[PDB]
Design a protein around this ligand. Structure first.
Ligand SMILES: Nc1ncnc2c1ncn2[C@@H]1O[C@H](COP(=O)(O)OP(=O)(O)O)[C@@H](O)[C@H]1O
Ligand SMILES: [Mg+2]
Ligand SMILES: [Mg+2]
Ligand SMILES: [Mg+2]
Ligand SMILES: [Mg+2]
Lengths: 319, 187, 228, 319, 319, 228, 319
DNA sequence: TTTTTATGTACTCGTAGTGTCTGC
DNA sequence: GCAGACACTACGAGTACATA
């Protein structure tokens, strides 16, 4: 069942699912993607998934594959307005040779400073809507301007239920077993992979990345003793920096997580709550909420986040 | 040379102009250039020392000034105050507020960020271009590949993406001439 | 390999279609645009003895230009390529085949729905007229029993109603009326006599210019109507 | 008596109105447009509305069609100054042999980077105004410089009167019923159609897009009505959690009620007003209202609502 | 008596004044323009005004008509430095066949990107100043470089004294009556014309445009008067409720003014100012301004208005 | 209505005065510079049979050059200018008559104050000397009883006192003294024999070059002097 | 003893000094220019002043007239690299038989785009310093490359000492009296000329221009004095309202600056900055920035500006 | 002492590349 | 005649500006 590119050297790029069925998705989400892939043509879609690694890019490419569409994958940061006027317009305005609908998958179109490309896309997506649809994948949909949201059918990856969580769990077990069989890795104990994929759920990209990082030894023994910040989904590095009261490291680190402020601030609040005394919890709520109030008027997000880091370092009693 | 043993000892410019050798004239005129005067660091330092200054004839950039001052927490409450509300203010008023507000201090140093590399930023940019992933995911991929041990194979695969105009994206300083050989043969 | 003047000019033309090209073993080379709106192929006299992928065909041809034509091109011991000509021996990197975008399969053009011919002077006149009149789209259609290329400026004429150029290609002698709209940016052909084969079926279709040197298959625009 | 474009498969693009009568506009707006088409000469117009889908591009194309104008539709973001000096001037300086007026519809001409181009138009529209009008559709009027707003009849979409909102909703319901009859969608009950029309109003397009999305099989089922209506229900659990002062329950209940803050805060104010001491009620309006007045600039609405819950627990007394 | 341009259908372009007497200008400006036409030689002039429609282009062309100048009207944005080096210099150096004075009307010459042509002009206006003068129309005088403002008579339009603003309004009302009579527009009430002049002043162009807009059927009546000046409601119930500090009544009345928030809040501040001690007027000025500042941000306006009402009642004093 | 080689050369020359020409029916074409510094007319052989205004005359003449000299120019049913060829038809747009700055009537030149004559060889060598010695100004004046064109370089000699060229035109039998300054950038005449009429009255002045087919009125410089 | 160009008609061009003794230079500058003329040879000079109309071009032409130099006047913006290689080298290399010194006056040569053209000139002087001398008049001295300033004698205009200011104001009043008695203009009040000189100092060209503008009727009476001394457009009314906490005056004036918000805010901040305590400086800039950031969000811009006035008048403590 | 954001747009200048006309 | 000279065009460097 599994799909392997046999060329890529990264497991999370080599074992990327090629079909909506192969994707590990909630039952409702998989059903609403099948209702689109079974309808023939694809309209404009915006795949929104606040939690990283749920698979918006994989789902978009699978949607293009199921319909048998002439996909043109474009990263959001590589979709500058001069690219939209050039190769993208040339692509959309022309019909494919073998009658396949053209779809442009703009990946992470929200995480970018280029909101001036979305303004062009506003009417680009109406000029060539009979020939080329657009699938825009976004982390937080506040980044996608309102007119594009009106143009595009917005599909938000819902939170899985309990039954869906268990089904995802078992599907993840089977998929990792097949990946390890195909990659020449022997599994020591199945509980190891079960604990791994429970720890990194629903961030399957993080799980595959951890497995691929471990794959040097060819055997899975520890699994849970993970390092190197465990992908960008984890935020433990910020907590370690704040514990040390290292203001310079916080200043140098703020630009890393300023690209997605909306998710980072919530994850930061959730993680700090469990690690601090209640009084400093109530203090951090006021501080973080005050910084969150003024994000919209903040000219630079990096300086805003750096100030939030400074306030947290200088006004919290750790536990 | 100079068959005539008397001469009048024309300098470089006289020989270049009197001969109408516009290549030599261009070379002699290029000997002035003098790209200098470091306009920025005499504003920030002035802000750090409350020294009187005027920028009416100068060029003021709010982003660079704010980023430079943000390195020092003592001045940052002022910077944040201009980070929310200074967008509409003029450059003159922005500088005036930063002058009046930022407290004096003997603060100097280097900007806090990743300290270049030109051996790691190129790898990140190349992985991001090849795998069509963002910079953060490119760092993730490179960190995975270094630990996994497959990085040299990947570099041998995508060393072709390195080209004449690609290196200029990595950096602006004149060091990319070495970079062309850095990944000349990863093998 | 030896790359003659004609093959070098053909490769320079192919470099406009795609930045690079995988030269496969044989006397046949082909390439397609990155987005897939056009494809090109050729049967060159020169014989290629080894597969090689060039990420920068423009740079490769620039290197070959200053060096003599009879230069021998081969692959180096370390995976790159080398061009040797007497006094010069210049090394050029060979990128991974999966890095550069090539069709990976020569597209078999189906039997044409309508076959006509466009002369070299007629094609050149169409190109210069397109430059002069700011024509950006053409439309090969049937008018009064002949097959005509009507050039419209799509910018000022969204629906392509105001004809700005009209070139008769020859008698039709058929029974199906079509209007194949070709973007003029997709026409990357070099000057020459071309046999124009227009194929269509449902919502799929293409236009193949078959020349004496190279064949260019271009894609029709979105709103191309026909009844094939 | 409907407009169908068989080329397109997007439902909001296939059924785009082609005449001003077929458009769904407020009484005064439609009267203005009918008057303009009856005079036979379109002036300079700016159709602007912050909320997309209100019918600006439709009205511009319909004004060009009704007047039988020579229309040049240009993406605004492509209308740079070298475009105004080139194609626009060539168009505006072409002979009107058959008496057709020339109308240059510059769609989505609110991009900031085009200000300079707009500053070129403010004299263009005075030299070619004898026979070449300009219709500028924009989302935010602040992106169109003041000298252009002076030259053009500025018409604001998406702001109808109370007596006209209901009429436009009724017209939308009739049009959606006709669309469903044409598309082969068999509506179970028109109540779901009314829910779709009300939910996405004034965005008439997001309405048709949702009509297509909630019609996968070919019928609008009753469960669609419960899906679109949403609004959850009574928030008594949140009020009890605030009284119990349990932070974790507050943040567990925050995300579900964060989707619709613009009602959740109204419900909270209407309900918990009687559930706390009158003296502290001002504090609530000193808190809750202030918390609301920052909603549009708060990055993480989940964290904003958790912050609201934090202050409500901290600074309120229970009777 | 009026100047009517037959080739123009736009009302504000059709009735463009041709002589200085026909222009609606301040008392001092009209004398300094009639003096210029009396001397017969136009000096370098810069007609500038931040508000469009004040009459800068009209006066610029009417001056060259009044002195019978050899006007070369030039779009400012098309006056790049290669144009100044070419056609403009050929114009200024030469002498006209008929002996008329040469004038270059560089209309709308305030673009920043043209600062490299203005810098070329500051000697052009001195080598050819005995032959050809320059009339620069601008919107912001800061776009005209200071050396250029020194060489010209800088005349600021649209800032008349109080005793002169009323004469402008009377003249514009008379001219609007003449325009209505020429256009076959029946006026039933002159108060609507007076209010139409008042609303758009000094933008006389927008005044004529709104005269056209509010005359779809060619009749100005009481309904048009209510439309131009709004005045949808009156403020007595809100004031009386604030007297009684009726929280429930204020909450109920808040959604009523959710439509015309700006007009309601302005009228409320105006009514409140006349009935409060000066000590508190400052306080509720701050309160009302703070509430109005975030109106475009707050999701629930009803809640915003309730917040404003309770703030007013808490910081309240009837004097 | 064919355009011969001579008419096309004449219209190409006119395109250097005004970017576009409003040419009306008949055998007469006249143009005026946008800034009104140089007017020109010509009685041409090819009869024009339809009023049309061309917003871009240089582009129109280029398009005409693309097709053969046998191309038949007419007014299309659309309203544009239809140039018909053996196999190609080109529809050059017709401009709005008010967007092309053209004379309403041919300006009637007054009775000339001073009449002389400049031969084709003299005009050609004056233009060539202007290219060589870099003179951008001429002054037609009286010297020792003969009318002379003095070529000055205005850039280095602002006061027009260092004569860089001097061409004697013919005898002057009148009793008036004059110095009519003409910018050489305003001498857009095609090579030929020109009867040079010069008229001045106070601040008014012009210089007409009557050719065998085309007449060119040129505006004198502001610092011209005379006693007429 | 005044210099009149009967050919010119602009007043500020008609009376242009033809010699150094006629100028209104400071004592030191006039003495050094007189010394330069007496020496007989002009060195390379750069006459620069940001304030236009100080006398730079006048002094350059006056020097080249006093020493009888073979002046070649160049528009500085036309002194591109081909001009340096072409006409400039031809001029410098030609033979001066009359013994007149060759001087190249490059007027207004402060354009940045001519950076390369300046380098060649700097090389040019190294090869043709004996043949020709170079006078560069400029406004922005930073536009002239540093090596040119190193080679040339830089003379700064328009910064005279207090004694020099008094003496040159007296000289300019005398010269304006001579101009008026030469133009057939009767001077009724002698203080009007002093007011004209004081207001427009150190711009003498603007002084003559204002003298021509206000002498429309040929009489300069106390009405002209009121017009000159009383600057319409200033914020003196707003400033005095702010210092007095005049609620009514600020309320009345708020709609007067409604249209021109940004410029008025900038001018207001610039004016107040110098008249308040440093702490008041921080506070005022904070309020101004915060209000200006919400300019596009608040509904009532007039009430917005009233709020701005209230805050500024309240939180300010004048020195 | 004290490094240099990213994107989009517009203008100017200098030069190298290309195409066309041509004079002793 | 055709190498040489002139004119048009595209590109890079540099500057300036707005916005986030
Ligand atoms: N729902 C999913 N089902 C299967 N694999 C997934 C899923 N989500 C992520 N992955 C893994 O993540 C990799 C890429 O993740 P991606 O789709 O880029 O997630 P995101 O864009 O949210 O980070 C794929 O190789 C795939 O193996
Ligand atoms: Mg992804
Ligand atoms: Mg639209
Ligand atoms: Mg104007
Ligand atoms: Mg000067």
């Amino acid at each position: 069942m599994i799909t392997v590119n046999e060329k890529e050297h990264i497991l999370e790029q080599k074992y990327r699912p090629s079909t909506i069925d192969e994707c590990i998705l909630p039952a409702f989400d998989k059903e609403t993607f099948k209702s689109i892939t079974s309808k023939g043509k694809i309209p404009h879609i915006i795949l929104h998934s606040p939690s990283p690694g749920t698979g918006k890019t994989t789902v978009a490419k699978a949607l293009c594959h199921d319909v048998n569409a002439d996909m043109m994958f474009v990263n959001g940061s590589d979709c500058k307005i001069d690219f939209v006027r050039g190769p993208l317009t040339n692509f959309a305005s022309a019909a494919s040779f073998d009658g396949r609908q053209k779809v442009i998958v703009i990946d992470e179109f929200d995480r970018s400073g280029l909101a001036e490309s979305q303004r062009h896309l506003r009417s680009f997506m109406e000029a060539y809507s009979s020939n080329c649809s657009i699938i825009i994948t976004a982390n937080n949909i506040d980044g996608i301007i309102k007119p594009l949201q009106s143009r595009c059918r917005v599909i938000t990856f819902g939170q899985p239920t309990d039954e869906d969580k268990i089904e995802m769990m078992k599907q993840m077990i089977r998929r990792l077993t097949e990946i390890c069989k195909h990659e020449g890795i022997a599994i020591a104990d199945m509980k190891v992979v079960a604990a791994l994929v429970k720890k990194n759920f629903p961030d399957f990209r993080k799980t595959i990345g951890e497995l691929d990082s471990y794959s040097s030894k060819g055997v899975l023994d520890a699994g849970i003793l993970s390092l190197v910040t465990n992908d960008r989904g984890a935020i433990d590095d910020v907590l370690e920096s704040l514990k040390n009261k290292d203001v310079k490291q916080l200043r140098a680190l703020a630009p890393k997580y300023a690209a997605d402020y909306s998710w980072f601030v919530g994850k930061l609040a959730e993680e700090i709550y469990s690690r601090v005394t209640p009084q400093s919890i109530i203090r951090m709520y006021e501080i973080v909420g005050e910084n969150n109030q003024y994000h919209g008027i903040a000219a630079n997000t990096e300086l805003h986040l750096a100030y939030l880091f400074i306030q947290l370092a200088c006004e919290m009693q750790w536990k | 040379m100079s068959l005539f043993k008397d001469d009048i000892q024309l300098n470089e410019h006289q020989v270049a102009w009197y001969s109408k050798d516009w290549t030599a004239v261009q070379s002699a005129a290029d000997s002035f250039k003098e790209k200098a005067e470091n306009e920025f660091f005499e504003i920030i330092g002035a802000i750090n020392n409350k020294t009187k200054c005027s920028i009416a004839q100068k060029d003021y950039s709010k982003f660079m000034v704010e980023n430079a001052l943000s390195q020092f927490p003592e001045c940052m409450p002022a910077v944040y105050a201009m980070n929310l509300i200074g967008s509409g203010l003029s450059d003159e008023a922005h500088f005036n507020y930063l002058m009046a507000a930022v407290p004096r201090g003997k603060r100097y140093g280097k900007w806090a960020k990743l300290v270049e590399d030109s051996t790691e930023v190129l790898i990140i940019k190349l992985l991001a271009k090849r795998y069509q992933v963002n910079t953060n995911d490119a760092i993730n991929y490179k960190s995975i590949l270094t630990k996994n041990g497959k990085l040299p194979l990947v570099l041998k695969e995508l060393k072709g993406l390195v080209t004449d105009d690609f290196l200029k994206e990595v950096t602006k300083n004149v060091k990319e001439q070495k970079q062309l050989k850095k990944l000349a043969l990863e093998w | 390999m030896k790359l003659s003047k004609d093959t070098t000019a053909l490769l320079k033309n192919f470099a406009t279609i795609n930045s690079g090209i995988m030269l496969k073993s044989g006397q046949f080379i082909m390439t397609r645009a990155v987005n897939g709106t056009t494809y090109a192929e050729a049967n060159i006299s020169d014989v290629i003895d080894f597969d090689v992928a060039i990420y920068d065909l423009n740079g490769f041809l620039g290197i070959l230009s200053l060096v003599n034509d009879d230069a021998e091109i081969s692959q180096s011991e370390d995976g790159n390529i080398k061009i040797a000509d007497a006094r010069s021996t210049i090394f050029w990197p060979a990128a991974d085949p999966s890095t550069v975008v090539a069709p990976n399969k020569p597209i078999p053009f189906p039997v044409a729905s309508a076959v006509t011919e466009i002369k070299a002077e007629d094609l050149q006149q169409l190109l210069r007229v397109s430059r002069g009149l700011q024509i950006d789209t053409i439309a090969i259609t049937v008018k009064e029993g002949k097959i005509v290329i009507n050039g419209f400026n799509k910018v000022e004429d969204s629906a392509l109603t105001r004809v700005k150029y009209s070139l008769t290609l020859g008698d039709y002698d058929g029974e199906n009326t079509f209007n194949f709209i070709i973007n003029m940016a997709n026409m990357k052909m070099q000057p020459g006599n071309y046999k124009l084969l227009l194929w269509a079926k449902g919502k799929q279709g293409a236009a193949k210019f078959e020349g004496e040197h190279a064949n260019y298959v271009v894609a029709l625009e979105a709103d191309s109507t026909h009844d094939f």
